[PDB]
Amino acid sequence: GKLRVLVADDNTVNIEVVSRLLKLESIYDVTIAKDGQEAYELVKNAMETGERFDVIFMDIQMPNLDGLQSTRLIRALGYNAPIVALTAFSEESNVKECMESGMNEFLSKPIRRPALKQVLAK
Amino acid sequence: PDFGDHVDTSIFGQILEMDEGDDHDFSAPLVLNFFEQAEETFQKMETALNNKDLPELSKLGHFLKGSSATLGFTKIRDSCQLIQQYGHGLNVDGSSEPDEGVCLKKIAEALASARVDTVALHKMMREFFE
Ligand code: BEF
Ligand SMILES: [Mg+2]
């Protein structure tokens, strides 16, 4: 009934926009990661405490550990739920390395309610 | 207000639709945060130019591209796209620039555009939001 969502981005502007769009979609249990190392730690903790994140939103470029590497580590942990890339496309096949890293779906900034909803439906 | 070529109204309008009211409850803090972020980012870019760290500059360019893109600040976004590419040692046409100096220089030129367009947009916004 209630979704538990993780949003990982280093940019607070994008965080607040995504958080609003999620709140509009009646999703309140939203945890924030500022980089990919935090994201890994939060998923690890979530599996350790038995609280599964139902979806993760993962920015590609972040300090300490980027989104591609964080995702690979997350899959390595055995987290098997969807991961959605938050991207600022400078290329088209950037998705291939993303999918190779373990990401499932793709949102390009600017992120809006129509596209987020389509992702959540599936 | 009249923003000009500084704002894509369609994209920025979608941000205003995320307000619960006409009081700009969401929009005004968000755009205020962006300007704090923009100034800090510009300062980190200057350090990186000083340290001549093209990779760091590429990440900083991309960082601010996403926030400027979400708010519809096209001029800042495009300058940020240029800083991202030149930081990868890439020209506009996609060729590699072996000359680090040229990359450094052109990043500075794009950063100058961004600082000017940021000041211009800061006024337009400070008015409109009041
Ligand atoms: F920093 Be992310 F790839 F927008
Ligand atoms: Mg980022």
XYZ file of N, CA and C and ligand atoms in Angstrom:
761
model
N 0.850 -1.215 0.000
C 0.000 0.000 0.000
C 0.875 1.250 0.000
N 1.691 1.389 1.051
C 2.666 2.464 1.148
C 3.945 2.048 0.425
N 4.466 2.941 -0.425
C 5.740 2.705 -1.086
C 6.875 3.323 -0.278
N 7.986 2.584 -0.205
C 9.214 3.073 0.396
C 10.225 3.284 -0.729
N 10.596 4.550 -0.959
C 11.346 4.949 -2.138
C 12.681 5.545 -1.706
N 13.731 5.245 -2.480
C 15.031 5.870 -2.306
C 15.332 6.742 -3.521
N 15.703 8.002 -3.256
C 16.139 8.933 -4.287
C 17.589 9.314 -3.993
N 18.474 9.036 -4.958
C 19.886 9.354 -4.841
C 20.277 10.364 -5.919
N 20.639 11.580 -5.480
C 21.166 12.627 -6.344
C 22.004 13.565 -5.476
N 23.001 14.216 -6.088
C 23.882 15.134 -5.381
C 23.345 16.565 -5.480
N 22.286 16.757 -6.279
C 21.741 18.075 -6.565
C 20.391 18.232 -5.864
N 20.338 19.111 -4.853
C 19.172 19.244 -3.989
C 17.972 19.805 -4.756
N 18.226 20.597 -5.805
C 17.164 21.131 -6.647
C 16.385 19.981 -7.284
N 17.104 19.042 -7.901
C 16.478 17.904 -8.553
C 15.786 17.023 -7.517
N 16.387 16.905 -6.325
C 15.801 16.125 -5.245
C 14.420 16.682 -4.902
N 14.333 18.003 -4.699
C 13.107 18.625 -4.224
C 11.999 18.513 -5.268
N 12.367 18.531 -6.555
C 11.405 18.425 -7.640
C 10.839 17.010 -7.679
N 11.733 16.021 -7.592
C 11.337 14.624 -7.622
C 10.481 14.313 -6.396
N 10.867 14.861 -5.236
C 10.140 14.637 -3.994
C 8.723 15.201 -4.075
N 8.570 16.382 -4.687
C 7.252 16.965 -4.884
C 6.407 16.053 -5.765
N 6.954 15.678 -6.926
C 6.243 14.845 -7.884
C 5.810 13.534 -7.230
N 6.657 12.994 -6.343
C 6.332 11.782 -5.606
C 5.231 12.055 -4.580
N 5.295 13.204 -3.899
C 4.290 13.553 -2.906
C 2.923 13.704 -3.573
N 2.902 14.303 -4.771
C 1.686 14.436 -5.563
C 1.109 13.061 -5.902
N 1.981 12.055 -6.038
C 1.566 10.694 -6.343
C 1.336 9.889 -5.062
N 1.172 10.588 -3.928
C 0.816 9.981 -2.654
C 1.918 9.043 -2.163
N 3.179 9.437 -2.386
C 4.337 8.692 -1.918
C 5.115 9.589 -0.958
N 5.141 9.196 0.321
C 5.645 10.049 1.387
C 6.916 9.461 1.997
N 6.984 8.127 2.103
C 8.153 7.453 2.646
C 9.270 7.492 1.605
N 9.972 8.631 1.557
C 11.043 8.867 0.604
C 12.324 9.139 1.388
N 13.344 8.304 1.165
C 14.652 8.485 1.775
C 15.590 9.086 0.729
N 16.498 9.968 1.173
C 17.383 10.697 0.272
C 18.820 10.215 0.464
N 19.519 10.009 -0.662
C 20.961 9.814 -0.679
C 21.602 10.938 -1.488
N 22.704 11.492 -0.971
C 23.368 12.615 -1.614
C 24.449 12.132 -2.576
N 24.837 10.855 -2.464
C 25.803 10.259 -3.372
C 25.586 8.747 -3.403
N 26.360 8.061 -4.249
C 26.175 6.641 -4.493
C 26.674 5.762 -3.348
N 27.586 6.286 -2.519
C 28.065 5.537 -1.367
C 26.963 5.483 -0.309
N 26.311 6.624 -0.064
C 25.159 6.679 0.823
C 24.077 5.725 0.314
N 23.846 5.720 -1.005
C 22.807 4.891 -1.599
C 23.068 3.416 -1.298
N 24.314 2.972 -1.493
C 24.695 1.604 -1.189
C 24.445 1.299 0.289
N 24.883 2.207 1.173
C 24.761 2.030 2.614
C 23.293 1.915 3.023
N 22.427 2.715 2.386
C 21.012 2.759 2.726
C 20.308 1.473 2.299
N 20.704 0.913 1.149
C 20.110 -0.319 0.653
C 20.578 -1.484 1.522
N 21.877 -1.492 1.840
C 22.469 -2.489 2.715
C 21.750 -2.483 4.063
N 21.589 -1.287 4.637
C 20.891 -1.124 5.901
C 19.450 -1.621 5.777
N 18.803 -1.297 4.652
C 17.403 -1.623 4.428
C 17.202 -3.136 4.349
N 18.180 -3.846 3.780
C 18.117 -5.296 3.692
C 18.456 -5.917 5.048
N 19.327 -5.248 5.815
C 19.748 -5.730 7.122
C 18.608 -5.621 8.134
N 17.800 -4.558 8.027
C 16.708 -4.313 8.957
C 15.399 -4.916 8.441
N 15.412 -5.435 7.205
C 14.263 -6.123 6.637
C 13.243 -5.175 6.004
N 13.623 -3.902 5.818
C 12.756 -2.899 5.215
C 13.152 -2.695 3.751
N 12.415 -3.313 2.823
C 12.768 -3.265 1.410
C 12.322 -1.944 0.788
N 13.245 -1.275 0.081
C 12.881 -0.206 -0.837
C 12.199 -0.825 -2.049
N 11.044 -0.269 -2.421
C 10.226 -0.833 -3.481
C 10.722 -0.327 -4.834
N 11.342 0.863 -4.849
C 11.992 1.388 -6.042
C 13.129 2.323 -5.620
N 14.160 2.418 -6.471
C 15.255 3.354 -6.274
C 15.354 4.264 -7.497
N 15.557 5.564 -7.246
C 15.888 6.520 -8.288
C 17.340 6.947 -8.107
N 18.139 6.771 -9.166
C 19.586 6.839 -9.071
C 20.116 7.792 -10.142
N 20.617 8.948 -9.693
C 21.353 9.873 -10.540
C 22.642 9.190 -10.989
N 23.128 9.533 -12.189
C 24.276 8.848 -12.766
C 25.568 9.403 -12.173
N 25.721 10.733 -12.177
C 26.956 11.359 -11.736
C 26.794 11.894 -10.317
N 27.651 11.405 -9.415
C 27.628 11.774 -8.010
C 29.037 11.601 -7.445
N 29.465 12.412 -6.448
C 30.796 12.261 -5.858
C 30.919 10.977 -5.038
N 32.167 10.593 -4.726
C 32.487 9.461 -3.862
C 32.241 8.143 -4.591
N 31.022 7.971 -5.116
C 30.680 6.808 -5.914
C 29.518 7.166 -6.835
N 29.703 6.947 -8.140
C 28.720 7.363 -9.124
C 27.571 6.358 -9.139
N 26.532 6.678 -9.916
C 25.300 5.909 -9.934
C 25.476 4.537 -10.576
N 26.333 4.459 -11.598
C 26.578 3.199 -12.281
C 27.177 2.194 -11.300
N 28.187 2.639 -10.540
C 28.930 1.770 -9.642
C 28.072 1.406 -8.432
N 27.316 2.381 -7.919
C 26.418 2.154 -6.800
C 25.405 1.065 -7.156
N 24.849 1.146 -8.376
C 23.858 0.199 -8.869
C 24.440 -1.211 -8.955
N 25.653 -1.342 -9.501
C 26.313 -2.638 -9.597
C 26.474 -3.260 -8.206
N 26.938 -2.460 -7.232
C 27.105 -2.909 -5.854
C 25.765 -3.317 -5.248
N 24.704 -2.579 -5.593
C 23.376 -2.841 -5.063
C 22.870 -4.186 -5.589
N 23.059 -4.439 -6.890
C 22.723 -5.726 -7.477
C 23.577 -6.823 -6.847
N 24.851 -6.510 -6.578
C 25.766 -7.455 -5.956
C 25.267 -7.861 -4.567
N 24.663 -6.917 -3.829
C 24.071 -7.196 -2.526
C 22.915 -8.187 -2.647
N 22.251 -8.195 -3.810
C 21.111 -9.066 -4.050
C 19.779 -8.321 -4.000
N 19.821 -6.984 -4.086
C 18.617 -6.176 -4.226
C 18.114 -6.284 -5.664
N 16.876 -6.764 -5.827
C 16.383 -7.199 -7.125
C 15.150 -6.403 -7.553
N 14.853 -5.306 -6.846
C 13.714 -4.469 -7.183
C 14.143 -3.438 -8.227
N 13.200 -2.706 -8.870
C 13.545 -1.765 -9.938
C 14.483 -0.635 -9.512
N 15.362 -0.231 -10.437
C 16.189 0.955 -10.278
C 16.034 1.820 -11.525
N 15.707 3.101 -11.304
C 15.423 4.042 -12.374
C 16.519 5.103 -12.391
N 17.098 5.322 -13.575
C 18.138 6.320 -13.751
C 17.510 7.703 -13.893
N 18.020 8.662 -13.109
C 17.768 10.079 -13.318
C 18.949 10.658 -14.091
N 18.702 11.075 -15.334
C 19.780 11.363 -16.264
C 19.653 12.785 -16.797
N 20.792 13.336 -17.223
C 20.836 14.574 -17.983
C 21.566 14.298 -19.296
N 20.824 13.708 -20.243
C 21.358 13.112 -21.463
C 22.255 14.075 -22.237
N 23.516 13.664 -22.440
C 24.400 14.269 -23.425
C 24.674 13.289 -24.565
N 24.141 12.065 -24.439
C 24.235 11.046 -25.473
C 23.005 10.143 -25.389
N 22.897 9.191 -26.326
C 21.691 8.392 -26.491
C 21.889 6.975 -25.953
N 23.064 6.397 -26.222
C 23.372 5.030 -25.840
C 23.960 4.965 -24.435
N 24.069 6.126 -23.782
C 24.406 6.203 -22.371
C 23.595 5.183 -21.569
N 22.412 4.830 -22.094
C 21.509 3.865 -21.482
C 22.131 2.465 -21.452
N 22.950 2.117 -22.452
C 23.467 0.760 -22.562
C 24.379 0.441 -21.378
N 25.301 1.357 -21.060
C 26.170 1.196 -19.905
C 25.339 1.199 -18.622
N 24.264 1.999 -18.608
C 23.363 2.066 -17.468
C 22.672 0.723 -17.238
N 22.196 0.097 -18.318
C 21.519 -1.187 -18.216
C 22.525 -2.284 -17.880
N 23.738 -2.157 -18.430
C 24.832 -3.059 -18.119
C 25.207 -2.969 -16.638
N 24.947 -1.816 -16.009
C 25.303 -1.601 -14.615
C 24.206 -2.114 -13.682
N 22.985 -2.283 -14.212
C 21.898 -2.901 -13.469
C 20.634 -2.045 -13.390
N 20.621 -0.889 -14.064
C 19.456 -0.016 -14.074
C 18.404 -0.576 -15.033
N 17.137 -0.223 -14.779
C 16.000 -0.828 -15.455
C 15.294 0.186 -16.350
N 14.984 1.361 -15.789
C 14.193 2.372 -16.477
C 14.945 3.700 -16.470
N 14.432 4.662 -17.246
C 15.192 5.854 -17.580
C 14.293 7.084 -17.586
N 14.681 8.070 -16.770
C 14.061 9.383 -16.754
C 15.132 10.430 -17.040
N 14.815 11.343 -17.961
C 15.721 12.409 -18.347
C 15.214 13.718 -17.750
N 16.105 14.452 -17.072
C 15.782 15.776 -16.568
C 15.516 16.695 -17.759
N 14.460 17.543 -17.751
C 13.567 17.725 -16.602
C 12.571 16.587 -16.392
N 12.395 16.190 -15.127
C 11.486 15.117 -14.760
C 10.114 15.721 -14.482
N 9.071 15.097 -15.050
C 7.705 15.574 -14.904
C 6.775 14.414 -14.559
N 5.557 14.770 -14.129
C 4.591 13.834 -13.576
C 4.203 12.758 -14.591
N 3.954 13.087 -15.881
C 3.590 12.066 -16.867
C 4.577 10.899 -16.932
N 5.873 11.213 -17.037
C 6.894 10.194 -17.233
C 7.115 9.392 -15.952
N 7.139 10.074 -14.800
C 7.322 9.398 -13.524
C 6.186 8.396 -13.303
N 4.953 8.790 -13.651
C 3.783 7.949 -13.450
C 3.864 6.685 -14.303
N 4.324 6.822 -15.551
C 4.451 5.683 -16.446
C 5.414 4.658 -15.849
N 6.521 5.143 -15.275
C 7.516 4.285 -14.650
C 6.902 3.550 -13.458
N 6.126 4.267 -12.637
C 5.608 3.713 -11.396
C 4.535 2.664 -11.681
N 3.791 2.853 -12.778
C 2.708 1.956 -13.149
C 3.234 0.541 -13.387
N 4.445 0.433 -13.948
C 4.977 -0.851 -14.379
C 5.646 -1.570 -13.197
N 6.424 37.315 -15.480
C 7.169 38.496 -15.983
C 7.783 38.183 -17.347
N 8.415 39.196 -17.954
C 9.122 39.043 -19.216
C 10.550 38.578 -18.936
N 10.832 37.310 -19.262
C 12.127 36.705 -18.993
C 13.022 36.788 -20.227
N 12.413 36.700 -21.416
C 13.147 36.793 -22.666
C 13.621 35.421 -23.134
N 14.894 35.353 -23.541
C 15.527 34.105 -23.932
C 16.142 33.413 -22.716
N 15.941 33.982 -21.520
C 16.556 33.466 -20.307
C 15.808 32.248 -19.769
N 14.512 32.125 -20.086
C 13.691 31.065 -19.523
C 12.811 30.449 -20.610
N 12.768 29.110 -20.641
C 11.752 28.380 -21.381
C 10.485 28.351 -20.531
N 9.472 29.109 -20.965
C 8.268 29.338 -20.182
C 7.505 28.036 -19.956
N 7.474 27.177 -20.978
C 6.762 25.914 -20.903
C 7.302 25.063 -19.753
N 8.635 24.966 -19.657
C 9.298 24.149 -18.654
C 9.162 24.807 -17.283
N 9.406 26.120 -17.226
C 9.298 26.862 -15.982
C 7.847 26.864 -15.498
N 6.900 26.935 -16.443
C 5.482 26.907 -16.125
C 5.084 25.624 -15.401
N 5.721 24.510 -15.781
C 5.448 23.218 -15.177
C 5.903 23.211 -13.717
N 6.946 23.990 -13.400
C 7.399 24.147 -12.026
C 6.338 24.896 -11.222
N 5.723 25.921 -11.830
C 4.724 26.734 -11.151
C 3.455 25.920 -10.891
N 3.161 24.956 -11.774
C 2.031 24.056 -11.594
C 2.237 23.148 -10.380
N 3.487 22.995 -9.926
C 3.791 22.160 -8.773
C 3.525 22.919 -7.473
N 3.261 24.228 -7.575
C 2.794 24.998 -6.433
C 1.373 24.568 -6.090
N 1.086 24.510 -4.786
C -0.249 24.199 -4.307
C -1.155 25.419 -4.481
N -0.578 26.623 -4.364
C -1.331 27.860 -4.501
C -0.729 28.804 -5.541
N -1.098 30.087 -5.428
C -0.524 31.161 -6.225
C 0.575 31.875 -5.437
N 0.851 31.395 -4.215
C 1.809 32.032 -3.324
C 3.240 31.593 -3.633
N 3.413 30.700 -4.618
C 4.729 30.214 -5.004
C 5.385 29.530 -3.803
N 4.603 28.680 -3.126
C 5.009 28.007 -1.899
C 6.181 27.064 -2.162
N 6.169 26.428 -3.340
C 7.191 25.475 -3.741
C 8.236 26.168 -4.616
N 7.766 26.956 -5.591
C 8.604 27.532 -6.631
C 9.637 28.508 -6.069
N 9.217 29.370 -5.135
C 10.053 30.470 -4.680
C 11.251 29.952 -3.883
N 11.077 29.023 -2.913
C 12.221 28.400 -2.242
C 13.163 27.662 -3.192
N 12.582 27.002 -4.202
C 13.326 26.148 -5.113
C 14.267 27.000 -5.962
N 13.740 28.110 -6.491
C 14.511 29.003 -7.339
C 15.528 29.759 -6.484
N 15.199 29.991 -5.210
C 16.126 30.629 -4.290
C 17.296 29.688 -4.012
N 16.986 28.403 -3.808
C 17.995 27.388 -3.560
C 18.928 27.281 -4.765
N 18.350 27.322 -5.973
C 19.120 27.193 -7.198
C 20.214 28.257 -7.276
N 19.905 29.495 -6.867
C 20.860 30.591 -6.962
C 21.989 30.421 -5.944
N 21.680 29.842 -4.780
C 22.697 29.541 -3.783
C 23.651 28.493 -4.351
N 23.054 27.456 -4.947
C 23.769 26.353 -5.568
C 24.634 26.862 -6.723
N 24.049 27.715 -7.576
C 24.732 28.254 -8.742
C 26.004 28.999 -8.339
N 25.919 29.824 -7.289
C 27.044 30.647 -6.867
C 28.161 29.745 -6.347
N 27.787 28.757 -5.521
C 28.738 27.818 -4.947
C 29.423 27.023 -6.058
N 28.631 26.558 -7.035
C 29.142 25.803 -8.171
C 30.138 26.635 -8.975
N 29.806 27.905 -9.232
C 30.710 28.791 -9.951
C 32.027 28.924 -9.191
N 31.965 28.949 -7.854
C 33.160 29.115 -7.041
C 34.020 27.853 -7.076
N 33.378 26.680 -7.125
C 34.100 25.422 -7.233
C 34.713 25.274 -8.626
N 34.075 25.869 -9.640
C 34.592 25.832 -10.999
C 35.864 26.673 -11.095
N 35.867 27.838 -10.434
C 37.019 28.730 -10.432
C 38.231 28.046 -9.806
N 38.020 27.371 -8.669
C 39.074 26.609 -8.018
C 39.626 25.562 -8.981
N 38.723 24.850 -9.666
C 39.098 23.768 -10.562
C 39.893 24.297 -11.754
N 39.483 25.453 -12.296
C 40.231 26.128 -13.350
C 41.631 26.485 -12.851
N 41.712 26.937 -11.594
C 42.973 27.292 -10.968
C 43.849 26.043 -10.855
N 43.254 24.938 -10.393
C 43.941 23.660 -10.291
C 44.009 22.976 -11.658
N 43.317 23.545 -12.654
C 43.335 23.057 -14.024
C 42.874 21.600 -14.057
N 41.792 21.315 -13.322
C 41.227 19.977 -13.231
C 40.030 19.893 -14.177
N 40.281 19.481 -15.426
C 39.241 19.409 -16.444
C 38.172 18.384 -16.066
N 38.533 17.197 -15.530
C 37.533 16.229 -15.071
C 36.574 16.765 -14.009
N 37.107 17.507 -13.028
C 36.297 18.087 -11.963
C 35.309 19.089 -12.558
N 35.793 19.889 -13.520
C 34.991 20.883 -14.215
C 33.870 20.214 -15.010
N 34.149 19.042 -15.588
C 33.146 18.324 -16.357
C 31.982 17.915 -15.457
N 32.303 17.482 -14.231
C 31.295 17.038 -13.282
C 30.491 18.227 -12.762
N 31.158 19.375 -12.590
C 30.517 20.580 -12.090
C 29.571 21.147 -13.147
N 30.002 21.098 -14.413
C 29.173 21.526 -15.527
C 27.894 20.703 -15.618
N 28.035 19.383 -15.474
C 26.912 18.463 -15.563
C 25.989 18.637 -14.358
N 26.593 18.826 -13.179
C 25.854 19.019 -11.943
C 24.804 20.117 -12.105
N 25.253 21.302 -12.532
C 24.401 22.477 -12.585
C 23.493 22.433 -13.817
N 23.866 21.638 -14.830
C 23.049 21.493 -16.025
C 21.677 20.926 -15.662
N 21.640 19.992 -14.704
C 20.412 19.308 -14.329
C 19.423 20.219 -13.602
N 19.942 21.098 -12.737
C 19.088 21.989 -11.968
C 18.595 23.133 -12.850
N 19.480 23.670 -13.698
C 19.106 24.729 -14.623
C 18.120 24.201 -15.667
N 18.279 22.928 -16.050
C 17.413 22.291 -17.030
C 16.005 22.105 -16.471
N 15.902 21.793 -15.170
C 14.616 21.504 -14.547
C 13.780 22.781 -14.428
N 14.450 23.915 -14.183
C 13.784 25.192 -13.986
C 13.537 25.886 -15.326
N 14.145 25.378 -16.405
C 13.960 25.937 -17.735
C 14.878 27.129 -18.013
N 16.029 27.181 -17.326
C 16.985 28.270 -17.473
C 17.976 27.917 -18.582
N 17.545 28.128 -19.831
C 18.175 27.533 -20.999
C 19.584 28.085 -21.208
N 19.770 29.388 -20.968
C 21.060 30.024 -21.189
C 22.113 29.425 -20.258
N 21.764 29.261 -18.976
C 22.682 28.692 -18.000
C 22.910 27.217 -18.319
N 21.847 26.521 -18.738
C 21.929 25.110 -19.087
C 22.918 24.897 -20.233
N 22.880 25.767 -21.251
C 23.696 25.596 -22.445
C 25.167 25.883 -22.139
N 25.431 26.937 -21.357
C 26.768 27.203 -20.847
C 27.279 26.003 -20.049
N 26.381 25.366 -19.288
C 26.746 24.228 -18.457
C 27.048 23.001 -19.317
N 26.311 22.851 -20.425
C 26.556 21.783 -21.380
C 27.952 21.956 -21.980
N 28.335 23.204 -22.277
C 29.640 23.477 -22.860
C 30.750 23.147 -21.862
N 30.564 23.508 -20.587
C 31.566 23.232 -19.566
C 31.721 21.723 -19.366
N 30.625 20.973 -19.518
C 30.657 19.526 -19.386
C 31.508 18.921 -20.504
N 31.315 19.403 -21.738
C 32.005 18.850 -22.895
C 33.479 19.252 -22.889
N 33.771 20.539 -22.672
C 35.149 21.009 -22.668
C 35.939 20.347 -21.539
N 35.256 19.999 -20.441
C 35.873 19.284 -19.334
C 36.268 17.858 -19.717
N 35.545 17.281 -20.688
C 35.884 15.983 -21.255
C 36.909 16.144 -22.376
N 37.356 17.382 -22.614
C 38.272 17.688 -23.699
C 37.595 17.614 -25.065
N 36.273 17.828 -25.097
C 35.489 17.704 -26.316
C 35.100 19.086 -26.828
N 35.274 19.285 -28.139
C 34.768 20.459 -28.829
C 33.274 20.279 -29.081
N 32.646 21.326 -29.623
C 31.222 21.327 -29.920
C 30.918 20.284 -30.994
N 31.842 20.103 -31.948
C 31.622 19.210 -33.077
C 31.888 17.759 -32.677
N 32.388 17.546 -31.453
C 32.581 16.211 -30.910
C 34.036 15.752 -30.988
N 34.885 16.549 -31.656
C 36.310 16.266 -31.747
C 36.964 16.477 -30.385
N 38.143 15.875 -30.203
C 38.925 16.058 -28.993
C 39.858 17.250 -29.168
N 39.977 18.047 -28.103
C 40.926 19.143 -28.060
C 42.157 18.674 -27.289
N 43.315 18.474 -27.959
C 44.545 18.109 -27.257
C 45.089 19.260 -26.416
N 44.765 20.492 -26.833
C 45.232 21.701 -26.175
C 44.408 21.946 -24.911
N 44.985 21.595 -23.755
C 44.365 21.841 -22.462
C 44.047 23.327 -22.302
N 45.001 24.189 -22.678
C 44.842 25.632 -22.583
C 43.531 26.127 -23.191
N 43.203 25.626 -24.390
C 42.006 26.031 -25.116
C 40.768 25.626 -24.318
N 40.802 24.419 -23.743
C 39.689 23.904 -22.961
C 39.466 24.785 -21.733
N 40.537 24.991 -20.955
C 40.537 25.891 -19.809
C 39.947 27.247 -20.196
N 40.451 27.826 -21.292
C 40.037 29.150 -21.726
C 38.544 29.170 -22.045
N 38.082 28.199 -22.844
C 36.702 28.181 -23.309
C 35.735 27.897 -22.158
N 36.188 27.134 -21.153
C 35.397 26.898 -19.952
C 35.187 28.223 -19.216
N 36.268 29.001 -19.066
C 36.213 30.318 -18.448
C 35.233 31.230 -19.192
N 35.242 31.171 -20.531
C 34.359 31.989 -21.353
C 32.900 31.608 -21.115
N 32.636 30.300 -21.013
C 31.293 29.792 -20.783
C 30.841 30.116 -19.360
N 31.780 30.070 -18.405
C 31.494 30.402 -17.017
C 31.134 31.882 -16.895
N 31.834 32.728 -17.658
C 31.529 34.147 -17.711
C 30.098 34.372 -18.204
N 29.703 33.684 -19.283
C 28.338 33.770 -19.784
C 27.344 33.381 -18.692
N 27.651 32.302 -17.962
C 26.758 31.794 -16.933
C 26.625 32.790 -15.782
N 27.727 33.441 -15.390
C 27.670 34.385 -14.284
C 26.823 35.592 -14.676
N 27.002 36.076 -15.910
C 26.254 37.223 -16.402
C 24.770 36.864 -16.483
N 24.450 35.731 -17.113
C 23.059 35.335 -17.281
C 22.417 35.038 -15.925
N 23.213 34.596 -14.945
C 22.691 34.328 -13.613
C 22.283 35.632 -12.930
N 23.124 36.668 -13.037
C 22.827 37.953 -12.420
C 21.556 38.523 -13.052
N 21.479 38.469 -14.387
C 20.328 38.967 -15.124
C 19.051 38.263 -14.663
N 19.131 36.944 -14.485
C 17.962 36.147 -14.158
C 17.587 36.320 -12.684
N 18.577 36.630 -11.839
C 18.350 36.824 -10.414
C 17.392 37.990 -10.171
N 17.491 39.036 -11.003
C 16.642 40.211 -10.886
C 15.224 39.889 -11.345
N 15.110 39.344 -12.562
C 13.832 38.965 -13.143
C 13.022 38.143 -12.140
N 13.706 37.226 -11.445
C 13.068 36.298 -10.526
C 12.711 37.011 -9.223
N 13.667 37.770 -8.670
C 13.481 38.447 -7.393
C 12.272 39.378 -7.462
N 12.027 39.941 -8.651
C 10.836 40.732 -8.910
C 9.599 39.836 -8.895
N 9.555 38.879 -9.832
C 8.370 38.078 -10.114
C 7.855 37.370 -8.860
N 8.767 36.753 -8.100
C 8.406 36.058 -6.874
C 8.105 37.067 -5.768
N 8.775 38.226 -5.822
C 8.608 39.286 -4.841
C 9.080 38.800 -3.466
F 24.243 14.141 -11.999
Be 23.261 13.344 -12.787
F 23.771 12.432 -13.862
F 22.250 14.308 -13.340
Mg 24.634 14.313 -10.045
